[PDB]
Design a protein around this ligand. Structure first.
Ligand SMILES: Cc1cc2c(C(N)=O)cccc2n1-c1nc2c(c(NCc3ccccc3)n1)COCC2
Ligand SMILES: Cc1cc2c(C(N)=O)cccc2n1-c1nc2c(c(NCc3ccccc3)n1)COCC2
Ligand SMILES: Cc1cc2c(C(N)=O)cccc2n1-c1nc2c(c(NCc3ccccc3)n1)COCC2
Lengths: 222, 222, 222
């Protein structure tokens, strides 16, 4: 949307320098993120170091480590007039170090929920955009049926339907179109990896920081 | 079946680089696994590092270490169009790090049960394929008798029968054929190393990830 | 179905004699259950005493108490030729004392799952059998939409729709028919009291006692 460059740093690249005690690697990451103006810096599974160290308690130490410290130092020294942007992604925000969320570094926190009915059709069609889809196979109804399903759950449904279609095509040689029955049968092994307790614990975090109470009704004098 | 090359990495080779802090060894493993296209990469007792560190809890840290991190990094960077394939083997999947089982790396999990009656005959005949077997020695009945027996249990039964036959042949000098009595007597010291609690705990893991409930009966409108 | 009498003993009646140290009350319960031949004896929330004492561990004692002991004594002394029948109901079977499940008393254990699509229509129509239901209000679709919903979840949906209809009827005086909009709007506050972890923990109990392994394929000689 911003016509900006994109740099992705997954968990293994972040945890490699933690184990290796070689911490000059973030230097070039932030250097090449700023020369490609405008760019966007994306940190995947930022909680990887916290999980590797234990998480909320772990050892006698807190939630502060060296790699996140280097990221904090590099982010503090950046120029606001540049168009470089840092995006952090995590699934466990309770073990994220509080100092990275301080105002001025990552003060903006937004919650990514489960895909809704409108967004699930997009996940199904993204998976099936390379496959022969029959006319009778209605993705709107399939997305309506699954409600608490994650993108991964729909992904494995599509993969299992494709596997069934491929197997039927192979065994039928001794049809080049995914049929309604393939999706109907593969719908039986429908998992739901995200539990309700997880949604509750993410919400407790969400309106932990919402706090829209107290000053809800204000009237100015004149 | 695929006419592909095979590379086996046992537990000691994986745990040697963990203790030695020398982690360039996975680099050449994955390099020589990909140049021999088509190949299959097999990791034996992947939980060796987790057992050496403690397992489910162990120290204050979680289930993430450096060697599994290197394997994750190498697997993430591979090309899907190549025919290289990675197979992980473990006996304790509860202590396996969750990140290696993420979709895209080792999402496919299949359970290897105890050999059934048809498969136990194969284990017996594989062990006895180099030994003189008498006609009256019926392996079908022997495999039928042992039910909750592992391949190792049948292996030691065959080894003990061979030991008894060799000892009788040596002492009789002062017959070059394994007799029915050798197997009948060696059948007395029949162990069963796998307990029922183990089977129960493996199943709890199995339909932990099965979840074939909820969407079992679906009817399309038209 | 058996044209038999029915006696229901809820949790409070069972826990009253536990606190009151007055344990002759089960005597008349079992006496009047057997004189009304044929009858059926139903014990609701049998785990109430275990919950009141702590459950799996609780105090230094085990899972045995006095009231369940009296029920065991009364059940052991009954005549099998009589048509009296005892049914125990519980939601936590992990804290149920093992001795009540011994063969001869309550050896038969069956699992009551969440209602399926066919059974959910019955729950909706049982709740709405006394209310004016509009023609366009399709209960089949409503039951299809809710999948992991308990009978209580559908019950509160129906109650909330009735409350909305009653409120609109009262405020409109200053219509005597539940409309499609009443159910559509009340569908927004749809709870799901039973979590997936609960279903998993009930299943672990279920094929704890299933054990259909080992002797799955048997062939007789002749
Ligand atoms: C293959 C695919 C897998 C996947 C997964 C997953 N855990 O497998 C999760 C989220 C999106 C996913 N996609 C996906 N991939 C794409 C698109 C798309 N739809 C938009 C969207 C994005 C985030 C959210 C909702 C819906 N979804 C759209 O076009 C590009 C590719
Ligand atoms: C000596 C031998 C020991 C052993 C053991 C063991 N813990 O001792 C476990 C599993 C298979 C084993 N084998 C074995 N070895 C072989 C074969 C064979 N049968 C097929 C099979 C494979 C896996 C499973 C079932 C049955 N079994 C077949 O031909 C090659 C050698
Ligand atoms: C008001 C009512 C509430 C309720 C609840 C609840 N937690 O509110 C749970 C289960 C059944 C319930 N019913 C109910 N009540 C009735 C019926 C019926 N349908 C059959 C049925 C039974 C058990 C199971 C499924 C479906 N369901 C049938 O006619 C008699 C009354």
């Amino acid at each position: 949307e911003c016509q900006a460059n994109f740099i992705s740093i997954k968990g293994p690249e972040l945890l490699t320098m933690w184990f290796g005690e070689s911490e000059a690697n973030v230097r070039e990451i932030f250097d090449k993120a700023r020369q490609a103006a405008p760019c966007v810096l994306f940190f995947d599974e930022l909680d990887s170091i916290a999980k590797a160290r234990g998480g909320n308690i772990g050892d006698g130490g807190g939630a502060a480590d060296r790699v996140i410290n280097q990221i904090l130092t590099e982010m503090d020294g950046m120029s606001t007039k540049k168009n470089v942007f840092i995006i952090g992604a995590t699934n466990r925000p309770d073990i994220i170090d509080p100092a990275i969320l301080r105002p001025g570094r990552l003060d903006q926190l937004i919650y990514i929920p489960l895909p809704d009915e409108k967004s699930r059709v997009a996940i199904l069609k993204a998976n099936l955009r390379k496959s022969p889809v029959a006319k009778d196979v209605d993705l709107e109804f399939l997305a309506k049926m699954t409600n608490g399903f994650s993108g991964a759950d729909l992904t494995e449904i599509c993969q299992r339907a494709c596997k069934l279609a491929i197997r039927e095509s192979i065994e039928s040689e001794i049809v080049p179109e995914i049929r309604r029955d393939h999706f109907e049968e593969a719908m039986r092994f429908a998992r739901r990896s995200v539990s309700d307790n997880d949604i509750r614990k993410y919400e407790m975090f969400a309106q932990t920081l919402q706090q829209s109470r107290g000053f809800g009704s204000f009237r100015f004098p004149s």
